[PDB]
Amino acid sequence: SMFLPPPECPVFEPSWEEFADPFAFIHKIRPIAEQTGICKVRPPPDWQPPFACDVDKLHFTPRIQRLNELEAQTRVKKDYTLRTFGEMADAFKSDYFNMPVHMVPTELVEKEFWRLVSTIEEDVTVEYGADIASKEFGSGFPVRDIKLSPEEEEYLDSGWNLNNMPVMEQSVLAHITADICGMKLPWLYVGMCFSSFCWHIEDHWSYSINYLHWGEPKTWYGVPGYAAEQLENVMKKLAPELFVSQPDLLHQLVTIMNPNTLMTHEVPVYRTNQCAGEFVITFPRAYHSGFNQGFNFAEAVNFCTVDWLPLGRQCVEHYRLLHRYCVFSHDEMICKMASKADVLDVVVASTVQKDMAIMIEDEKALRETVRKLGVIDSERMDFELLPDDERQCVKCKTTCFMSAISCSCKPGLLVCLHHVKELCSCPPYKYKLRYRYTLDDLYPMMNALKLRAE
Ligand SMILES: Nc1cccc(-c2cccnc2)c1
Ligand SMILES: [Cl-]
Ligand SMILES: [Mn+2]
Ligand SMILES: [Zn+2]
Ligand SMILES: [Zn+2]
Numbered sequence: 053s054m055f056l057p058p059p060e061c062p063v064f065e066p067s068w069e070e071f072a073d074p075f076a077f078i079h080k081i082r083p084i085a086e087q088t089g090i091c092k093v094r095p096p097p098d099w100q101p102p103f104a105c106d107v108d109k110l111h112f113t114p115r116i117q118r119l120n121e122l123e124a125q126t127r128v129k130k131d132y133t134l135r136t137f138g139e140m141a142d143a144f145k146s147d148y149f150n151m152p153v154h155m156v157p158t159e160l161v162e163k164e165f166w167r168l169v170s171t172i173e174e175d176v177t178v179e180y181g182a183d184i185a186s187k188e189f190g191s192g193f194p195v196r197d198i199k200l201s202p203e204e205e206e207y208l209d210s211g212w213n214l215n216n217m218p219v220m221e222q223s224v225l226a227h228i229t230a231d232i233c234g235m236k237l238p239w240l241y242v243g244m245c246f247s248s249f250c251w252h253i254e255d256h257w258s259y260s261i262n263y264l265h266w267g268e269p270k271t272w273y274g275v276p277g278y279a280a281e282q283l284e285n286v287m288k289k290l291a292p293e294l295f296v297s298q299p300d301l302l303h304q305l306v307t308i309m310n311p312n313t314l315m316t317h318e319v320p321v322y323r324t325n326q327c328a329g330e331f332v333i334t335f336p337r338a339y340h341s342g343f344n345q346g347f348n349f350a351e352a353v354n355f356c357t358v359d360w361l362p363l364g365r366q367c368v369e370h371y372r373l374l375h376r377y378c379v380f381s382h383d384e385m386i387c388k389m390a391s392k393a394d395v396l397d398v399v400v401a402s403t404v405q406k407d408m409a410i411m412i413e414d415e416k417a418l419r420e421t422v423r424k425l426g427v428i429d430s431e432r433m434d435f436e437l438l439p440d441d442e443r444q445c446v447k448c449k450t451t452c453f454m455s456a457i458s459c460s461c462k463p464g465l466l467v468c469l470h471h472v473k474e475l476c477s478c479p480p481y482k483y484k485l486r487y488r489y490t491l492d493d494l495y496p497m498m499n500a501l502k503l504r505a506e
Contacts, residue, residue, distance in 0.1 A: 055166045057159075058311050061088045061274055061322035068096040074211040075222035075357060078259075078333065082359065088322045089338030090274030093331040095212065100329070101193060102203045103265050107135040112189050114179040117247060119308065121169040122291045125250055127304040128182045134242070134349075137181070141244035141347040144178070148245065153268065153346050158325050161345050162271055165246055169308050180344075181242030184233060191215055191238060192265040192351050212331070214238045214263060214353045221397045224356040224364075224404075225258070229388060230436070232380050238353040243270065243344030250306035251287070251341040253280065254334065255379045257367040258354040262332040267348025269325040270332075273311045277337035279319050286317045301377045308341065336363045358403035365407060372448045372470065381453040383411055384436055387488070393500035402505035408498045415454050416491060418469040425472055426480035427457060433486035447471040455487040 062084050070077055077093075085091035111133055117125070132140070145153045149160075168174045185191045193213040194204040207213055211220060218236045219226050225236055235255055245268075254260050257277075264270055275283050287309065288295055294305040311321040325345070326332050334340050336359075356364065368382045389396060389404045396404070435443055435453045443452045445468040456466040459476050466486070467475045475483070489497075 055163050055310075056312055056315075057162065058273060058315065058321040058323040061085075061272070061324045062091045063094065063324070064091060065094045066096065068098060071096050071099065072211070074217065074261075075220070078357065079359065082335070085333065086335045086338075087276050087278075088274060088320075089276040089279075090272055090322060090324065090332055090334050090340055092324045092326060093333060095329065095331070099210075099212070101207045101210070101213070102201065103192060105134065105192075107138065108133055110134040110189050112137075112181045112183065112242065115182060117178050117180060119165075119169050119174075119176050119178065119246060119248065120172070121308050121310060124291075124293055124305045124307060127252070127302070127306060129302070132179075132181075137179075137242060137244070138347050140179070145245035145346050153245075156346075158269060158271065158345055161245065165248075165271075165343050166310055166312075168246070170310065176246065178244055178247045180244060180247035182239060184237045184239055189240060192240070192263075192349060193238075212263075214261065214351055217261065217353060217355050222357060222400065224358060224361060224385070224389070224400065225354070227388060227392060228380060228385050230380050230384065230440075235354045235379055238351050241350040241352065243267070243346075243348045243350065245346045246343055248308060248343035249341055250308055251283075251339055252304075252306050253337050253339055254354055256356070256382070257337040257363050258356050258360065259336060260334045260352055260354050262326070262334070262350060262352040264326050264328050264330055265349045265351060266328045268344065268346030269327050270342060270344050270348060270350060272324045272326060272332055272340060272342040274322050274324075274334065275314070275339040276320060277335055280337045280339060282317070282319045283314060283339050286314055286319060297375065301379070336360055337367075358400055361403050361407045362410075365410065368450065372445075372450045372468070375448045377444070377449045378440075378451040380440075381435075381451045384451075384453040386411060387453070387497065390497040390501055393497070393504045396501070396504055398505055401501045405498060405501035405505055408494075408501060411454070412491070412494050412498065415494075419455065419485065419487075422457065422469050422472050422485060427472065427483045427485050428481060429483070430485035430487060432490075433488065435486075435488050445471055447474040452486075453488055455485060457483050458486055459483050 114132055142153055149156050168176050193215055194207050195215055315321050364382050386408055440451055446465050450468050452466055457472050459478050459482055461478045462476045
């Protein structure tokens with residue numbers, strides 16, 4: 053009537069054998085899970101990482117949050133200990149419902165969440181924690197440093213220890229050298245009743261994996277990747293303010309929106325309650341949002357498999373059309389892998405090779421086009437040495453790497469090869485093509501990959 057809960061997303065209970073390799077397991081479930089955008093994974097009963105912290109020494113700066121549907125919020129960047137936050141959080145829930153926190157049914161919190169965000173008269177504000185690990189507040193998984201217990205040491209090298217999964221081999225984001233802290237490092241999330249994460253997809257349409265270490269559940273809504281644009285069109289119509297051009301990455305606007313509203317407009321939505329000890333995985337370009345049932349502690353990280361590579365290229369194309377800033381250069385990542393073809397996982401090498409072939413053909417065509425526009429002069433340029441904000445296309449903000457156009461008249465400015473007309477009013481013979489590699493450099497790099505893939 054008031055709120056109809058979306059159907060449940062798939063839940064997987066892998067055996068220890070199925071579970072041991074996270075990449076093999078994700079690949080196995082992908083045909084099912086990519087149809088629902090999110091899925092939940094219950095680890096084998098044996099898999100039980102140790103969770104030990106002193107709640108009095110873990111400190112973090114809280115973020116404040118208003119809870120009104122369709123209202124704009126900014127993507128995340130006063131002090132609590134984990135204890136005082138927990139005490140504030142439990143008191144809030146307990147007072148809000150006049151009940152002990154666990155006797156409040158999840159069904160009811162969900163129902164109440166969607167009531168209160170729609171009602172303009174209710175001005176509920178809540179607080180939460182969000183940041184990468186620091187010496188003030190570290191990962192909930194064991195990391196090396198302090199003598200570890202035997203239980204802790206068992207989980208140091210687990211493929212599901214989220215600290216590892218970036219730097220594992222079947223991960224592609226691994227040997228990106230350009231350190232992109234916000235995306236190779238796990239984030240830590242301290243939740244309280246109703247604290248929520250707005251609808252979004254991950255940077256570069258990557259996967260994410262989310263672990264609830266302890267506390268009350270996290271409630272999720274998820275939309276399959278194939279319906280991303282449907283969802284966006286629904287949001288444009290009902291909340292156009294979110295779609296105004298933003299000056300940078302730290303200004304992305306996001307919002308709370310009832311899944312029933314999406315379901316009404318024929319966007320498939322699924323839900324789950326994630327409990328302590330469970331994983332949620334989000335698939336490429338799968339929109340998701342949710343809220344916490346109460347006091348809890350989660351940890352999440354982006355990652356990119358070989359399955360993702362073509363989507364990663366499509367995403368950067370999509371960012372260009374939108375004039376959205378990139379977190380990293382996709383081509384730069386591809387070439388870095390090519391330059392390391394000998395030490396690459398062989399299935400990885402095979403997949404990179406295919407993306408690289410497309411990259412080279414597109415680049416060949418683009419260079420021919422700008423030559424026909426009268427750009428004649430050229431010089432090699434090591435783009436990877438430039439700070440990102442010193443190599444963005446003036447027009448579409450894409451991070452340049454394969455090539456760019458400069459002009460002596462606008463010193464320091466670049467455009468990508470799609471935007472040659474947008475740099476300045478000088479005649480194109482005054483322009484230079486700056487390029488990382490010649491085509492003659494590129495084909496041997498691709499050959500090393502092919503040999504490695506055999
Ligand atoms: N910025 C921000 C703040 C809090 C949670 C989250 C979140 C949670 C769960 C999945 N994705 C993102 C994101
Ligand atoms: Cl409200
Ligand atoms: Mn997310
Ligand atoms: Zn000029
Ligand atoms: Zn451009």
